[PDB]
């Protein structure tokens, strides 16, 4: 699946085409939660080393948090790319095929019949 | 809703970073300050259930249950102290942290729009409770009654996910709003059989129906008082709640499929109501009581009259405060003499002459006393079930007589008839005990004035 | 006021409620659609109001 | 000393620093006899280093705070209950022999670590090897249950498997209970409770046992002589290296491993030196154990959170 | 051993697997397997005890003969209309022998007989490198050759892996064995989905690698070959243990923890297609593995009832044993379920 | 069996107790019970039922005054509807 | 109930029953009778703990070998129960009939 | 009520009895290298027999 | 207390922490600049 799409230019992380997609804002809750995830990372590190946590976490905690914001940021970007090309593929294949997917008119309730067993 | 999600999440580091001896003060304080805005949550009006955000919303029922939760934390935590009041700080902050996180997943669950978010947050609610009661439960042999307890849940509680995802890809959205308006009738056959049975029994494991009721007693005798007020004031109402919502579909099916379960709950109401009469060891009595009222709830859910819901939800809340409190009485009696066995000590009309009023008052509120919300809910439920079957009132009102008998038997032989005089320990009352009792009853008696808050979505 | 340092522990969750509340109020902007367009409620925009809410 | 495996590929220092005079040496004497005059004495003349009296406060005073804290954390020894006849199984032996034994092993790994690290040989108070005839002779008549030869003996074997033979050993033969009289002379009343049969069976099985060990692992210089201070300063000091260096060829043992050394073996020993909790682990091991050292966890856990000196931290100035 | 040579070997293992991934020719891929064996025999046996020798042999036989069977299938492909490429096999039979072969390469139901044994024989680090790294090559091949896979086989081998391999481990008090049988179960899943939407297979692959990664790394932290060792560490230091247990529940796929995510997505893309019965038939066994693992969670408590917790074993000195990346993978395997819109980043 | 000497007495160990009862009795009894009870005592008309009364009054008055029978049943006019056929 | 026959008590039963009975009794009377100062908490007597533990149903989880047991329990939840199933389904269906046909004479029923 | 309770934990004790003798479904292993190896080889050729007709 | 030695982690290493904060500056400001430029070119791909 989708390897025919991206096997044309292999191992492109995200292509020169992706830059037309709006990048995730800073404060995007996802990568912020990733920052928290670096926070609990560093906390568990300071639990591993018997030191009391909240100590040494001046440089460490910041290193963790910033690292995950970095990596997680790029990951989110390429993600939004992936769903972009997915939705595009859907709509193109929709339009190019009238027969496969029929457009039916949805008739209003005026013509409807049901059973609807009442309670009693 | 997010304005209620942050403040508790911020209430976590409030716990973690703090000076020793102030943790209870800080947590209690800010937690009640949460309860204020929990009371802010009522805008609910007219017809459309308010929707805060596209992820999660609130109709009525979610609002009373939620208010009850956010109200219940500060009282719970308030109650849990002096169960220990000696330990390393890490035990305290760990425990309060766990109660917090538990509340968070509860709010997630009640507010959750979409049933898969409801389910993930569902078991995510079950874990913290388990950690609470198992890690220190006073552990009589421990029974291993937390863990394979979680197996009592998941054993048949997992496949409801299967059935859900089926509903997902067939109809698209699992948003509850759009699952409404798109719900389409499902005929009676063997596939709809295994499905309806899947969802139904999946939730019916939580509020114990008489078949499965062995679930509660052990888990609830092993629970520390905080885990008890968690458990039987809330964690059953999750099952009954989700039941309320997922019964939206299954429209004709629930008749032919309902009937056996209804039978089992009408008989088991009487059975459980009986067995809870003769037992010793007070902590169990209120448990099987919970089993009884919850059986009555299931009876109310399956028959779909709106009256049935109004009385139902009313019974969820009223039984929540009542059962919760009454547990906390059992505990306040347990710290005095270390027993758990009812018949051991007696008296306490002579001694603790005030604690009488809270025993009496609470027991009466479980006696189905007419203005009490418990009798509002129980009453409407009896009306609905009599509408369904003219005959069933023999069983119902027979539960009235038995529930009267044990509910008023607990009021005695713990509290009356003699002082055993080999005790000479019990220290008179506390201010904290009175605070807990008061914080329970006083709202339960006030709600008996303006109940239209707690009656269900249909009203 | 700076003396809150003495009480600093307490001010946290109030800032919590404020913070989340402002997040909902902003969220409504993202949810904003159909502002005057719903069939029950249609108004000719008041001279001082370009927005119903 | 090969701190990380990268230190190896950066430098080989284990092989680079060899004095030819180091090897490893263990002074020995039966209790109270040889003691510190030999080890301190060659430490003066020969110039190697010396480890002081082993016990609770060796492992206790090795790290953590500077010097030891009370034994209530351990709850061990109080050697008055070691010395006479508390044949009952309650706190009489176990804590003492196991705790002090792990102290001995830790002492030995400390010796090897120092040797390979700084390239200067050391002498050892008592060998890890003297202790199996020590304890085996302690239970050899009573004063503890059977299964202690089993638990402690499997700890012997499994533990010692990877370390070393170390090269020579100095022991002075007590002339037939003389020290049993001389311990009457030391002026330590708690110690004089000991009887003769234990001591002399200790020394008999000591010689008759280690002599096949002596020939069995490298060589030794053992003396029955006449004031081992001066007998030392002549035959032990001079004859030690004099016939040691040339005599080491017949040693084998560490001659094959040290014959290779550098990478491989030397890398594995030197790498296994640091983090004593890794080496003592097997002594800590058999986490089954028995009701021997058993402590219902409340004691050591309340000792944990009640841990004084360094409790939460590794090196932190928060507390003194 | 020499501290270089281990780098000059591990480098060749990484290299071999990289070749199995990169090459478009069969004979190459076959070579990549040959190099991963040749170079992975020294990693196991690192310490010279006989256990690692007999166990390393039982790895060598079945692994090597697996490779040969792979070559047989390749050649039958050459017989039937054929060229040397990596793409849909043109023989149904060659596809059969190749699914069996790649079913030996990685543990599967008829072929899993060796994994528990070899996993307990060899040491910890070899345990890590056996149950994760070498598991990248065969999936990387199956993702390629899936179009010609006979559905009935791989579906079978998957289920029987979950049933048999998962059901196992019950009486086992050893750890390495538990990790083996769990490996076979996650195998049963990854290969179960393989034909429908391989994206999920690579997903459960990655999550799985993180899972066993933190697991074994913790076993290096607290050196433990048994559950008894786990409890004794609980009374040495708590935190590492609760990391071990929480990661074990994540290995059980318990809903809030991140291990529930591959199960959950597998159930979506499994059940949007027609068959709903088979997923439940997997989820039952999944519960089995669960309450086994939660037996291992009643291995612990506080105000414990008597575990015989002993002594000497309070220590004044922290351990310097170097744990490479523990924390990132610990939090990353606990907290990940609130992610995965990120799923699609993978493919 | 720890009990207290009951120097005065309350919740917790001494000298913070007074503050404890102050915060729990105040924030618990004062603010939420009295304040909240006044809030939900009379909050805006809940579920709209007051509006329902007014609207009902107006509509009924209209229904009589213009002579139409009130409450016609048929929730939707059969004038606009279609029926299936056999 | 109804003391009768005025037993002659014989000789053994006199000596044995008397001496041994009141023997054990007075042993335990004096036993819990200590009642000193300095006990703050309950007297804890091992009696009634046996009551509680046994009445917690110690043989409940193990098994229930057949004998007459499955007959007493099965027939104990059989006759009334399943018959009540049949009667509520019966009167159910009747109610549905008289609703769907004829008249139940509900007239104004409304809230239901 | 002791009949329904003892039958409920007697049926759950029939599931743990099915877990007791389900451990036999685990104990059906004879732990013999001439059993699961050669039987997995024969029954594996029966996976190519069942896969021969499947 | 700590008469033994200075255990290596005990006292800080001011070269290491300098390098780590170096990584913080480089990494973080590089991220910000990345954001700004990608938003800019994103503006170019479309128009006002
Ligand atoms: C009438 C309306 C219809 C009622 C229909 C039912 C009738 C029968 C009810 C059951 C029996 C009641 C009874 O007497 O129980 C014994 C019980 C305790 O008596 P006791 O233990 O024998 O003697 C007290 C001690 O010996 C020594 O203590 P003391 O003498 O120093 O102080 C006594 C008093 C001291 O007061 C306080 O402690 C302060 C309370 C502040 C409340 C703020 C709100 O109370 C207490 O100390 C604790 C009890 C009060 C708890 C909180 C209120 C509970 C109300 C229970 C229902 C109302 C029953 C009487 C109604 C009469 C008409 C108003 O008394 C009460 O329950 C009476 C409460 C009076 C105080 C509140 C009055 C106004 C409350 C608002 C209106 C309530 C309407 C409730 C409707 C029904 C809900 C279920
Ligand atoms: C230590 C002493 C303790 C005394 C306890 C109480 C004893 C009983 C007698 C009380 C006599 C004084 C009552 C307050 C004075 C105002 C009365 C008045 O003007 O009524 C007509 C007046 C009518 O004027 P309006 O504004 O045109 O009508 C509004 C409707 O009534 C709105 O419609 P509605 O359906 O909400 O009807 C109001 C109804 C129903 O309200 C409820 O059911 C509220 C339910 C709250 C649930 C909260 C759940 C939290 C979780 O509540 C009442 O009628 C009052 C009874 C409840 C009092 C609760 C006091 C705190 C406990 O009633 C009101 O406005 C209701 C006021 C709001 C309720 C709370 C009022 C009490 C505040 C604390 C006072 C505590 C006692 C002070 C000492 C007294 C003895 C020395
Ligand atoms: C230089 C080549 C090195 C190859 C060997 C290293 C990879 C094997 C060891 C790590 C395995 C990691 C988990 C499985 C692969 C995850 C693939 C992935 O996330 O690719 C992202 C993307 C995928 O790249 P892509 O989508 O352009 O092409 C690969 C297509 N797949 C993998 C779906 C078949 O990788 C990169 O952008 C790399 C630059
Ligand atoms: C995909 C990548 C899979 C990685 C598998 C493990 C590789 C490391 C092998 C280490 C070998 C060894 O002996 O280590 C022992 C040593 C410790 O053992 P030791 O110290 O006793 O022996 C080592 C001896 N020397 C130093 C000479 C080599 O290290 C460890 O145990 C650390 C293991 C860390 C594992 C980290 C796993 C990260 C997984 C990331 C997945 C991300 C996917 C993203 C896709 C998009
Ligand atoms: C912010 C400050 C965080 C302070 C952390 C706690 C400080 C401390 O000393 O913690 C010690 C404790 C370890 O103690 P130990 O006895 O080993 O206990 C192990 C038992 N599991 O270790 C711990 O308590 C672990 C760390 C706990 C961290 C709690 C969470 C901190 C705040 C971030 C979460 C909230 C984010 C809110 C985001 C906005 C809302 C959306
Ligand atoms: C979902 C996304 C989640 C986030 C994934 C990204 C992980 C990024 C790496 C985190 C590294 C954290 C770190 O550096 O921790 C510090 C600690 C050592 O501390 P340090 O400051 O290096 O100084 C040494 C002094 N002790 O570090 C250590 O002890 C270990 C150092 C680890 C070095 C390797 C780091 C690899 C980084 C690239 C990973 C890319 C993964 C992308 C794909 C993810 C798919 C899920």
């Amino acid at each position: 699946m989708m390897t025919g799409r991206q096997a044309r230019a292999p191992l492109q992380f995200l292509p020169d085409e992706a830059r037309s997609l709006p990048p995730p804002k800073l404060t995007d809750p996802r990568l912020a939660y990733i920052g928290f995830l670096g926070y609990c990372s560093g906390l568990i590190d300071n639990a591993i080393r018997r030191r009391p946590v909240l100590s040494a976490g001046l440089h460490r905690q910041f290193l963790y948090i910033t690292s995950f914001v970095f990596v997680g940021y790029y990951l989110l970007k390429r993600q939004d790319y992936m769903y972009a090309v997915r939705d595009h593929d859907m709509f193109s294949y929709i339009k190019s095929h009238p027969e496969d997917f029929p457009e039916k008119d949805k008739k209003t309730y005026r013509e409807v019949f049901e059973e609807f067993h009442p309670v009693r | 809703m997010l304005k209620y999600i942050i403040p508790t999440m911020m209430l976590m580091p409030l716990t973690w970073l703090s000076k020793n001896s102030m943790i209870w003060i800080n947590t209690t304080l800010h937690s009640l300050l949460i309860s204020l805005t929990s009371l802010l949550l009522l805008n609910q009006f007219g017809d459309n259930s308010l929707n805060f955000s596209l992820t999660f919303f609130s109709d009525s029922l979610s609002t009373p249950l939620l208010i009850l939760t956010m109200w219940l934390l500060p009282l719970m935590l308030m109650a849990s102290q002096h169960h220990l009041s000696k330990e390393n700080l890490a035990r305290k902050k760990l425990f309060i942290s766990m109660l917090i996180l538990l509340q968070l997943f509860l709010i997630m669950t009640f507010t959750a729009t979409e049933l898969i978010f409801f389910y993930i947050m569902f078991e995510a609610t079950l874990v913290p409770t388990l950690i609470i009661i198992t890690r220190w439960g006073n552990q009589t042999e421990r029974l291993n009654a937390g863990l394979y307890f979680l197996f009592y849940t998941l054993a048949g509680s997992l496949p409801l996910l299967v059935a859900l995802i089926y509903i997902q890809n067939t109809m698209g959205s699992l948003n509850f709003l759009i699952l409404q308006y798109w719900v389409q009738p499902m005929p009676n056959s063997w596939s709809n059989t295994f499905m309806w049975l899947a969802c139904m029994m999946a939730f019916m494991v939580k509020m114990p129906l008489y078949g499965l009721h062995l679930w509660l007693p052990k888990a609830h005798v092993e629970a520390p008082i905080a885990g008890s007020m968690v458990l039987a004031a809330i964690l059953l109402k999750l099952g009954g709640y989700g039941m309320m919502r997922i019964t939206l579909l299954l429209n004709p099916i629930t008749d032919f499929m309902a009937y056996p379960f209804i039978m089992l709950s009408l008989w088991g109401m009487i059975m459980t109501s009986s067995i809870c009469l003769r037992q010793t060891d007070l902590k169990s009595l209120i448990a099987y009581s919970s089993v009884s009222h919850m059986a009555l709830v299931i009876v109310a859910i399956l028959i779909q009259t709106p009256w049935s819901y109004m009385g139902a939800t009313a019974l969820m809340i009223a039984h929540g405060l009542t059962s919760s409190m009454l547990f906390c009485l059992a505990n306040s009696n347990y710290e005095r003499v270390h027993s758990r066995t009812m018949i051991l000590a007696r008296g306490l009309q002579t001694l603790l002459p005030l604690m009488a009023a809270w025993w009496l008052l609470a027991s009466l509120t479980n006696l189905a006393l007419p203005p009490s919300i418990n009798l509002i809910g129980e009453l409407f439920v009896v009306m609905s079930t009599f509408s369904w079957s003219n005959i069933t009132i023999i069983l119902m009102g027979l539960n009235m007589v038995i529930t009267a008998l044990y509910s008023l038997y607990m009021l005695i032989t713990t509290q009356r008839g003699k002082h055993t005089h080999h005790i000479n320990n019990i220290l008179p009352s506390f201010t904290r005990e009175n605070a807990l009792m008061s914080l329970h009853m006083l709202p339960l008696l006030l709600l008996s004035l303006n109940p239209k808050i707690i009656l269900g979505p249909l009203y | 006021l700076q003396v809150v340092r003495d009480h600093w522990i307490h001010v946290l969750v109030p800032v919590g409620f404020v913070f989340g509340y402002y997040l909902d109020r902003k969220n409504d902007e993202k949810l904003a659609a159909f502002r005057n367009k719903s069939l029950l409620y249609k108004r000719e925009l008041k001279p001082n109001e370009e927005v119903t809410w | 000393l090969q701190y990380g495996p990268l230190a190896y590929i950066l430098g080989e220092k284990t092989t680079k620093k060899m004095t030819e005079n180091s090897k490893l040496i263990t002074v020995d004497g039966n209790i109270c006899s040889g003691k510190s005059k030999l080890a301190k004495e060659v430490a003066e003349k020969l110039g190697l280093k010396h480890f002081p009296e082993a016990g609770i406060h060796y492992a206790d005073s090795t790290t953590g705070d500077g010097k030891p804290l009370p034994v209530r954390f351990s709850g061990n020894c109080s050697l008055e209950k070691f010395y006479d006849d508390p044949k009952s199984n309650d706190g009489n032996s176990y804590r003492l022999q196991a705790w002090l034994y792990a102290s001995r092993l830790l002492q030995y790994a400390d010796a090897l670590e120092h040797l390979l690290s700084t390239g200067q040989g050391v002498v050892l108070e008592r060998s890890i090897y003297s202790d199996f005839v020590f304890l085996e002779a302690m239970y050899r008549q009573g004063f503890i249950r059977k299964q202690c030869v089993d638990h402690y003996n499997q700890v012997k074997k499994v533990t010692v498997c990877e370390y070393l033979p170390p090269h020579v050993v100095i022991y002075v033969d007590v002339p037939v209970s003389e020290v049993q009289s001389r311990i009457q002379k030391k002026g330590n009343p708690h110690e004089m409770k000991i009887t003769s049969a234990y001591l002399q069976d200790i020394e008999n099985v000591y010689k008759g046992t280690f002599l096949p060990e002596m020939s069995e692992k490298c060589e030794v210089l053992q003396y029955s002589a006449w004031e081992a201070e001066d007998a030392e300063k002549v035959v032990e000091d001079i004859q030690y290296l004099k016939y040691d260096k040339g005599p080491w060829l017949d040693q084998d043992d560490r001659k094959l491993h040290n014959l290779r050394m550098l990478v491989q073996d030397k890398l594995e020993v030197l790498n296994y030196t640091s983090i004593p909790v890794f080496l003592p682990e097997v002594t800590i091991g058999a986490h089954q154990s028995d009701r021997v050292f058993q402590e219902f966890t409340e004691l050591p856990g309340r000792k944990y959170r009640a841990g004084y000196n360094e409790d939460v931290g590794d090196k932190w100035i928060w507390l003194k | 051993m020499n501290p270089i040579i281990l780098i000059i070997i591990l480098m060749t293992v990484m290299l071999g697997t990289i070749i199995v991934m990169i090459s478009t020719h069969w004979l190459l891929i076959w070579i990549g397997f040959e190099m991963n064996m040749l170079a992975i025999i020294p990693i196991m046996m690192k310490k010279h005890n006989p256990r690692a020798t007999e166990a390393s042999t039982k790895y060598f036989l079945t692994q090597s003969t697996a490779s040969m069977l792979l070559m047989m299938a390749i050649i039958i492909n050459l017989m039937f209309s054929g060229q040397w490429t990596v793409m849909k096999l043109f023989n149904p039979m060659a596809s059969m022998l190749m699914t069996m072969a790649l079913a030996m390469k990685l543990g599967m139901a008829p072929f899993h007989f060796w994994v528990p044994e070899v996993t307990q024989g060899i040491p910890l680090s070899s345990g890590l490198i056996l149950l994760t790294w070498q598991k990248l090559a065969p999936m990387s091949v199956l993702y390629q050759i899936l179009p010609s896979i006979n559905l009935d086989l791989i579906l079978t081998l998957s289920i029987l892996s979950i049933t048999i391999g998962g059901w196992g481990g019950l009486n086992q008090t050893q750890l390495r064995k538990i990790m083996a049988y769990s490996s076979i179960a996650h195998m049963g899943w990854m290969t179960a989905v393989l034909l429908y939407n391989p994206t999920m297979t690579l997903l459960n692959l990655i999550i799985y690698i993180i899972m066993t990664s933190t697991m074994f790394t913790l076993f290096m932290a607290n050196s433990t070959t048994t559950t008894l060792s786990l409890s004794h560490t609980w009374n040495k230091a708590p935190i590492m243990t609760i990391l071990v247990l929480i990661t074990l529940l994540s290995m059980g796929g318990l809903p809030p923890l991140s291990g529930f995510m591959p199960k959950w997505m597998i159930i979506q893309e499994m059940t949007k297609n027609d068959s709903i019965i088979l997923p439940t038939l997997m989820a039952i066994t999944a519960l089995l593995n669960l309450y086994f693992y939660m037996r291992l969670t009643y291995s612990t408590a506080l105000t414990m009832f008597p575990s015989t917790n002993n002594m000497k074993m309070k220590w004044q000195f922290p351990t310097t044993k170097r744990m490479t990346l523990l924390p990132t993978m610990t939090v990353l395997s606990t907290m990940l379920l609130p992610l995965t819109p990120i799923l699609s980043i993978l493919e | 069996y720890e009990k207290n000497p009951d120097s005065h007495g309350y919740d917790k160990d001494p000298a913070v107790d007074v503050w404890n009862m102050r915060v729990v009795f105040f924030f618990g009894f004062s603010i939420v019970l009295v304040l909240g009870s006044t809030f939900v005592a009379y909050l805006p008309d809940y579920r709209m039922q007051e509006w329902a009364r007014r609207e009902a009054e107006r509509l009924v008055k209209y229904r009589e005054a213009h002579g139409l029978p009130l409450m016609e049943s048929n929730c939707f006019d059969p004038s606009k509807i279609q029926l299936p056929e056999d | 109930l109804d003391p009768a026959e005025y037993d002659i008590s014989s000789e053994t039963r006199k000596a044995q029953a008397e001496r041994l009975a009141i023997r054990s009794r007075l042993k335990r009377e004096y036993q819990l009778q200590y009642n000193d100062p300095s006990r703050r908490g309950v007297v804890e007597d091992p009696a009634l703990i046996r009551w509680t533990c046994a009445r917690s149903a110690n043989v409940y989880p193990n098994f229930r070998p057949n004998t007459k047991t499955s007959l007493l329990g099965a027939l104990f939840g059989i006759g009334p129960l399943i018959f009540w199933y049949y009667v509520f389904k019966t009167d159910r269906d009747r109610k549905e009939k008289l609703i769907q046909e004829g008249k139940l004479d509900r007239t104004f029923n409304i809230s239901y | 009520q002791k009949s329904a309770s003892s039958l409920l934990d007697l049926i759950w004790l029939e599931t743990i009895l099915p877990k007791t003798i389900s451990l036999a479904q685990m104990k059906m292993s004879t732990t013999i290298t001439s059993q699961k190896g050669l039987i997995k080889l024969y029954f594996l050729s029966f996976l190519i027999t069942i896969l021969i007709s499947t | 207390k700590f008469y033994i030695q200075e255990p290596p982690h005990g006292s800080p290493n001011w070269l290491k922490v300098g390098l780590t904060l170096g990584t913080s500056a480089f990494l973080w400001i590089y991220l910000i600049k990345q954001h700004n430029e990608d938003v800019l070119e994103y503006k170019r791909r479309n128009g006002l």
Side-chain angles (χ1 to χ4, degrees), chain D residues 9 63-64 69 74 76 95 99 300, chain E residues 1-4 7 47 228-229 232 235-236 304 307-321:
Chain D
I9 70 173
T63 185
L69 48 78
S74 65
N76 297 341
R95 299 180 182 177
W99 181 259
Chain E
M1 70 194 86
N2 300 337
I4 294 297
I7 292 170
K47 302 310 289 185
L228 173 61
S229 298
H232 180 55
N235 293 129
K236 185 177 70 65
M304 298 178 68
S307 299
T308 62
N309 305 124
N310 304 137
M311 193 193 74
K312 302 183 297 295
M313 289 181 274
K314 180 172 300 305
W315 296 109
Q316 193 70 262
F317 51 88
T319 68
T320 189
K321 187 180 294 297

Side-chain angles (χ1 to χ4, degrees), chain B residues 216 272-273 276 284-295 319 323 326-327 366 403 406-407 410:
Chain B
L216 179 65
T272 297
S273 296
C276 59
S284 65
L285 300 179
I286 311 102
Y288 294 97
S289 299
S290 177
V291 174
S292 179
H293 298 293
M294 294 301 102
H319 179 66
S323 61
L326 187 61
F327 291 149
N366 192 29
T403 299
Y406 77 84
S407 181
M410 171 182 65

Side-chain angles (χ1 to χ4, degrees), chain B residues 349 353-358 360-361 364-365 369-373 438 441-442 444-446 448-449:
Chain B
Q349 288 301 101
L354 185 144
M355 194 69 179
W358 298 111
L360 175 61
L361 181 61
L364 297 180
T365 57
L369 201 145
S372 174
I373 301 302
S438 58
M441 283 292 100
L442 297 174
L444 181 60
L445 298 180
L446 295 180
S448 293
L449 292 174

Side-chain angles (χ1 to χ4, degrees), chain B residues 24 27-28 31-32 68-83 95-96 98-100 102-103 106 129 132 224-235 320 324-325 327-328 331 432 435-436 439-440, chain F residues 24:
Chain B
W24 300 111
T27 54
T28 50
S31 184
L32 293 173
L68 175 57
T69 304
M70 291 181 180
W71 171 253
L72 189 59
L73 176 68
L75 171 60
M76 186 179 290
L77 184 147
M78 178 67 181
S80 63
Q81 63 185 21
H82 184 68
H83 166 59
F95 175 73
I96 293 172
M98 188 62 69
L99 295 175
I100 298 302
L102 174 60
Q103 180 180 358
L106 288 172
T129 296
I132 294 171
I225 191 63
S228 175
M229 290 186 286
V230 169
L231 177 65
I234 297 301
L235 268 64
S324 177
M325 174 176 177
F327 291 149
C328 187
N331 187 30
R432 185 186 64 207
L436 272 54
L439 292 174
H440 289 87
Chain F
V24 63

Side-chain angles (χ1 to χ4, degrees), chain E residues 42-56:
Chain E
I43 303 301
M44 296 180 286
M45 297 176 70
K46 180 180 171 61
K47 302 310 289 185
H48 299 287
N49 54 33
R51 299 288 293 170
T53 300
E54 60 182 341
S56 64

